[PDB]
Protein backbone atom coordinates (compact mmCIF):
# COMPACT_ATOMS: atom_id res chain seq x y z
CA UNK A 1 0.00 0.00 0.00
CA UNK A 2 0.92 3.73 0.21
CA UNK A 3 3.80 4.78 2.51
CA UNK A 4 3.61 8.27 4.13
CA UNK A 5 0.21 8.98 2.59
CA UNK A 6 -0.50 11.35 5.54
CA UNK A 7 2.74 13.38 5.11
CA UNK A 8 3.77 13.25 8.78
CA UNK A 9 7.30 12.35 7.54
CA UNK A 10 9.52 14.02 4.89
CA UNK A 11 9.41 13.20 1.19
CA UNK A 12 12.25 10.72 0.63
CA UNK A 13 12.89 11.49 -3.10
CA UNK A 14 15.24 8.58 -3.87
CA UNK A 15 13.80 6.90 -6.98
CA UNK A 16 17.02 4.94 -7.64
CA UNK A 17 17.26 3.09 -4.28
CA UNK A 18 13.79 3.50 -2.60
CA UNK A 19 11.09 3.87 -5.34
CA UNK A 20 8.47 2.46 -2.90
CA UNK A 21 8.63 5.84 -1.09
CA UNK A 22 7.47 9.17 -2.62
CA UNK A 23 9.78 10.58 -5.34
CA UNK A 24 9.72 13.35 -7.98
CA UNK A 25 10.88 12.88 -11.62
CA UNK A 26 11.43 15.95 -13.87
CA UNK A 27 12.10 16.02 -17.62
CA UNK A 28 14.66 18.85 -17.27
CA UNK A 29 17.09 16.36 -15.68
CA UNK A 30 17.05 14.23 -18.89
CA UNK A 31 17.42 16.66 -21.87
CA UNK A 32 13.67 16.31 -22.75
CA UNK A 33 12.39 19.83 -21.87
CA UNK A 34 12.99 22.62 -19.32
CA UNK A 35 10.64 21.01 -16.72
CA UNK A 36 11.84 21.86 -13.18
CA UNK A 37 10.62 21.89 -9.56
CA UNK A 38 12.27 24.72 -7.53
CA UNK A 39 11.16 23.55 -4.05
CA UNK A 40 9.25 20.72 -2.29
CA UNK A 41 8.59 19.48 1.26
CA UNK A 42 6.12 18.76 4.07
CA UNK A 43 4.65 21.10 6.63
CA UNK A 44 1.69 20.97 9.03
CA UNK A 45 0.64 17.49 7.81
CA UNK A 46 0.60 18.10 4.03
CA UNK A 47 2.97 17.94 1.02
CA UNK A 48 3.83 20.96 -1.22
CA UNK A 49 5.57 20.97 -4.67
CA UNK A 50 6.59 24.29 -6.27
CA UNK A 51 6.86 24.26 -10.07
CA UNK A 52 9.28 26.70 -11.77
CA UNK A 53 8.96 25.37 -15.36
CA UNK A 54 6.09 23.03 -16.31
CA UNK A 55 7.55 21.45 -19.47
CA UNK A 56 5.44 20.68 -22.59
CA UNK A 57 3.55 17.52 -21.56
CA UNK A 58 1.70 16.45 -18.42
CA UNK A 59 4.17 13.63 -17.56
CA UNK A 60 7.18 16.05 -17.66
CA UNK A 61 6.80 16.39 -13.83
CA UNK A 62 5.73 13.33 -11.81
CA UNK A 63 5.12 12.74 -8.05
CA UNK A 64 5.06 8.97 -7.75
CA UNK A 65 5.40 5.81 -5.55
CA UNK A 66 5.70 2.06 -6.49
CA UNK A 67 2.93 -0.17 -5.05
CA UNK A 68 1.98 -3.88 -5.22
CA UNK A 69 -1.62 -4.80 -6.30
CA UNK A 70 -3.45 -8.10 -6.80
CA UNK A 71 -4.66 -9.07 -10.28
CA UNK A 72 -8.48 -9.14 -10.49
CA UNK A 73 -9.03 -7.21 -7.24
CA UNK A 74 -11.00 -3.99 -6.72
CA UNK A 75 -9.51 -0.96 -4.92
CA UNK A 76 -10.43 2.58 -3.92
CA UNK A 77 -8.03 5.39 -4.85
CA UNK A 78 -8.42 8.60 -2.79
CA UNK A 79 -6.56 11.86 -2.26
CA UNK A 80 -6.89 15.52 -1.20
CA UNK A 81 -5.39 18.32 -3.33
CA UNK A 82 -5.27 22.03 -4.09
CA UNK A 83 -3.12 24.68 -5.84
CA UNK A 84 -2.33 28.38 -5.37
CA UNK A 85 -3.87 29.07 -8.80
CA UNK A 86 -6.57 26.95 -10.48
CA UNK A 87 -5.28 24.28 -12.91
CA UNK A 88 -5.56 20.54 -13.77
CA UNK A 89 -3.40 17.51 -12.78
CA UNK A 90 -3.62 13.83 -13.77
CA UNK A 91 -3.76 10.79 -11.46
CA UNK A 92 -2.71 7.40 -12.82
CA UNK A 93 -1.92 3.73 -12.07
CA UNK A 94 0.70 2.63 -14.65
CA UNK A 95 3.60 0.27 -15.25
CA UNK A 96 6.96 1.15 -13.56
CA UNK A 97 8.91 0.34 -16.75
CA UNK A 98 8.60 0.68 -20.57
CA UNK A 99 6.10 0.71 -22.24
CA UNK A 100 4.44 2.53 -19.33
CA UNK A 101 0.92 1.08 -19.91
CA UNK A 102 -1.73 3.22 -18.16
CA UNK A 103 -4.10 0.89 -16.24
CA UNK A 104 -6.05 3.81 -14.67
CA UNK A 105 -6.11 7.50 -15.74
CA UNK A 106 -8.20 10.57 -14.74
CA UNK A 107 -7.72 14.37 -14.79
CA UNK A 108 -8.96 16.58 -11.90
CA UNK A 109 -9.39 20.41 -11.81
CA UNK A 110 -7.78 21.96 -8.69
CA UNK A 111 -8.70 25.26 -6.97
CA UNK A 112 -7.21 27.22 -4.00
CA UNK A 113 -9.55 25.27 -1.63
CA UNK A 114 -8.76 21.76 -0.38
CA UNK A 115 -11.00 19.12 -2.02
CA UNK A 116 -11.23 15.29 -1.96
CA UNK A 117 -11.30 12.98 -5.01
CA UNK A 118 -12.24 9.24 -4.79
CA UNK A 119 -12.37 6.59 -7.60
CA UNK A 120 -12.95 2.79 -7.80
CA UNK A 121 -10.35 0.75 -9.75
CA UNK A 122 -10.14 -2.95 -10.73
CA UNK A 123 -6.57 -4.27 -11.35
CA UNK A 124 -6.65 -6.11 -14.72
CA UNK A 125 -6.30 -9.93 -14.75
CA UNK A 126 -3.00 -9.67 -16.67
CA UNK A 127 -1.52 -6.46 -15.26
CA UNK A 128 1.93 -6.40 -13.59
CA UNK A 129 1.94 -7.16 -9.79
CA UNK A 130 4.23 -4.19 -9.03
CA UNK A 131 3.15 -0.87 -10.58
CA UNK A 132 3.21 2.82 -9.58
CA UNK A 133 0.80 5.58 -8.62
CA UNK A 134 1.61 8.86 -10.45
CA UNK A 135 0.43 12.45 -10.11
CA UNK A 136 1.33 14.31 -13.36
CA UNK A 137 2.06 17.99 -12.69
CA UNK A 138 3.47 19.13 -16.06
CA UNK A 139 2.19 21.42 -18.85
CA UNK A 140 -0.31 23.45 -16.83
CA UNK A 141 0.40 26.70 -14.97
CA UNK A 142 3.59 27.03 -12.95
CA UNK A 143 2.39 27.25 -9.33
CA UNK A 144 2.47 25.40 -5.97
CA UNK A 145 0.42 22.17 -5.74
CA UNK A 146 -0.53 20.52 -2.37
CA UNK A 147 -1.45 16.92 -1.38
CA UNK A 148 -2.83 15.07 1.67
CA UNK A 149 -4.49 11.75 2.72
CA UNK A 150 -3.43 9.60 -0.27
CA UNK A 151 -4.73 6.02 -0.02
CA UNK A 152 -5.05 2.94 -2.23
CA UNK A 153 -7.18 0.41 -0.28
CA UNK A 154 -9.05 -2.85 -1.01
CA UNK A 155 -12.76 -2.33 -1.55
O1 LIG B 1 19.25 5.88 -22.13
C2 LIG B 1 18.66 6.43 -23.29
C3 LIG B 1 17.96 7.73 -22.91
O4 LIG B 1 17.65 7.77 -21.50
C5 LIG B 1 17.00 8.98 -21.12
O6 LIG B 1 16.71 8.37 -19.55
C7 LIG B 1 15.79 7.54 -18.89
C8 LIG B 1 14.41 8.17 -19.02
O9 LIG B 1 13.91 7.96 -20.33
C10 LIG B 1 13.52 7.49 -17.95
O11 LIG B 1 12.09 8.35 -17.65
C12 LIG B 1 10.90 7.72 -17.26
C13 LIG B 1 9.93 8.44 -18.18
O14 LIG B 1 10.12 8.13 -19.55
C15 LIG B 1 8.59 7.98 -17.63
O16 LIG B 1 7.47 8.85 -18.43
C17 LIG B 1 6.50 8.09 -19.07
C18 LIG B 1 6.67 8.43 -20.53
O19 LIG B 1 7.91 7.90 -21.03
C20 LIG B 1 5.45 7.84 -21.24
O21 LIG B 1 5.47 8.28 -22.63
C22 LIG B 1 4.44 7.82 -23.49
C23 LIG B 1 5.11 7.06 -24.60
O24 LIG B 1 5.85 5.98 -24.12
C25 LIG B 1 3.97 6.61 -25.53
O26 LIG B 1 4.73 6.32 -26.84
C27 LIG B 1 4.69 5.33 -27.85
C28 LIG B 1 4.73 6.01 -29.20
O29 LIG B 1 5.74 7.00 -29.24
C30 LIG B 1 4.94 4.93 -30.25
O31 LIG B 1 5.02 5.55 -31.52
O32 LIG B 1 3.78 4.13 -30.18
C33 LIG B 1 3.64 3.42 -28.96
C34 LIG B 1 2.42 2.53 -29.14
O35 LIG B 1 2.81 1.21 -29.48
C36 LIG B 1 3.49 4.40 -27.79
O37 LIG B 1 3.54 3.74 -26.54
O38 LIG B 1 3.48 7.79 -26.12
C39 LIG B 1 2.80 8.65 -25.22
C40 LIG B 1 2.41 9.92 -25.97
O41 LIG B 1 1.01 9.88 -26.04
C42 LIG B 1 3.72 9.04 -24.06
O43 LIG B 1 2.95 9.59 -23.02
O44 LIG B 1 4.26 8.37 -20.69
C45 LIG B 1 4.04 7.94 -19.35
C46 LIG B 1 2.69 8.46 -18.86
O47 LIG B 1 1.62 7.85 -19.58
C48 LIG B 1 5.19 8.48 -18.47
O49 LIG B 1 5.13 8.03 -17.14
O50 LIG B 1 8.46 8.43 -16.30
C51 LIG B 1 9.30 7.65 -15.49
C52 LIG B 1 8.92 7.70 -13.99
O53 LIG B 1 7.63 7.16 -13.81
C54 LIG B 1 10.71 8.09 -15.84
O55 LIG B 1 11.61 7.37 -15.03
O56 LIG B 1 13.97 7.69 -16.63
C57 LIG B 1 15.15 6.97 -16.40
C58 LIG B 1 15.63 7.24 -14.97
O59 LIG B 1 14.54 7.75 -14.24
C60 LIG B 1 16.23 7.33 -17.43
O61 LIG B 1 17.14 6.25 -17.33
C62 LIG B 1 17.82 10.25 -21.49
O63 LIG B 1 17.04 11.39 -21.24
C64 LIG B 1 18.23 10.29 -22.96
O65 LIG B 1 19.19 11.30 -23.23
C66 LIG B 1 18.79 8.94 -23.43
O67 LIG B 1 19.00 8.98 -24.85
CA1 LIG C 1 -1.75 14.73 6.73
Residues 6+ apart with CB under 8 A from 83: 110, 111, 112, 143, 144, 145, 146
Q: Is there an atom of ligand 1 within 6 Å of 90 CB?
A: no
- Nearest ligand, CA of residue 27? 1
Bridge partners (DSSP) listed for residue 78: 118, 151
d(C-alpha 20, C-alpha 112), whole Å: 29
Report the candidate in 81, 85, 88 with the shortest Cα–Cα distance to residue 146. Answer: 81
Any idea where the domains of the chain sit in the sequence? 1-155
d(C-alpha 135, C-alpha 112), whole Å: 18
Domain 1-155 fold = Jelly Rolls (2.60.120)
Resolution (angstroms) equals 1.9
B/e letters for 4-27, b = 16+ CB within 10 Å, e = fewer, are: bbebeeebbeebeeebebbbbbbb
Bridge partners (DSSP) listed for residue 25: 62
Which long-range contacts link 97-104 to residues 24+ away (Cβ below 8 Å)? 101/127, 103/127, 103/131, 104/77
This entry's atomic model was obtained through X-ray
d(C-alpha 29, C-alpha 24), whole Å: 11
d(C-alpha 32, C-alpha 68), whole Å: 29
Pocket test for ligand 1, best of 30, 37, 91, 135 (most atoms within 8 A of CB): 30
Amino acid sequence: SINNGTFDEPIVNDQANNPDEWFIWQAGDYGISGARVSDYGVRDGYAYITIADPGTDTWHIQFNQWIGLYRGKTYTISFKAKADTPRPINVKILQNHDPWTNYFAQTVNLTADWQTFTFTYTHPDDADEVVQISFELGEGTATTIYFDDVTVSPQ
